Symmetry: C3
Subunit: 106 residues, 3 copies
């Protein structure tokens, strides 16, 4: 999928996690987020279209999604363990990674 569609999937499911009441909604949303994060790694964002494909900026872009995926992993295991509020608090901390990438590359 396009980068913006993957971003839509990340944002829509973050909202689902924040509003969620049970572990099933959270786990389902985090699984969708992981898939969108990895697929976004394949994209070149418009602001880096003037960069080499292995420039430090594109490596930084791609590793940002590895960092997001590992944060999603921690939240997803908490959701699996039934720790709904902890899984939601971990999903809130995802936003630092969202924001940091946007600051550099949106």
């Amino acid at each position: 999928a396009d980068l913006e569609d993957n971003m839509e999937t990340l944002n829509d499911n973050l909202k689902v996690i924040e509003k969620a009441d049970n572990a099933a909604q959270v786990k389902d949303a985090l699984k969708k987020m992981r898939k969108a994060a990895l697929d976004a790694k394949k994209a070149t964002p418009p602001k880096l279209e003037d960069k080499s494909p292995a420039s430090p900026e594109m490596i930084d872009f791609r590793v940002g999604f590895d960092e997001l995926a590992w944060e999603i992993h921690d939240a997803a295991h908490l959701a699996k363990e039934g720790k709904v509020k902890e899984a939601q608090a971990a999903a809130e901390q995802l936003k630092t990674t969202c924001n940091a990438c946007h600051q550099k590359y949106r």
Copy 2:
């Protein structure tokens, strides 16, 4: 290892999982598949032999193995947490990821 040997590792251990009897075989097989998936990221497939290692097809290729590794991760936790049958089911669903990369780059 080179790409073909990692692919044999993937194929052989997928068969071990399909024909497994105990959790130890499945856990051991999935850990070997993850290792092989990550090692395969270092390779250049013959159909991309001449392209540049940072071309979008090479990025798509390498991210295919992150996706495979994360799907292996879910199956390995199913094996580690008991559910041998559901791990084998998840291992079987990996073939969709195997096949999607093969359609493009094999």
Copy 3:
């Protein structure tokens, strides 16, 4: 952070794990190691500075940190279930992955 600081974070936290008393200390140190491994993957090491950013060496360097991160994952899960000695032994085996990269790119 730069590569050398991330390397000292890896080494310091491996020391912390070796002298830890309880699982919380081991888990917290492994998460710091995971953060540093991913941040170091963004770096260009001195030995490859005069190579193409898209060189096969640079890809091999970055995949090494994926392999480290996934080994840290298994150690971290041992710590989460409270298996202190088992987590410490797995942390100790990380040194094989540390050294394998150093042999090539130190």
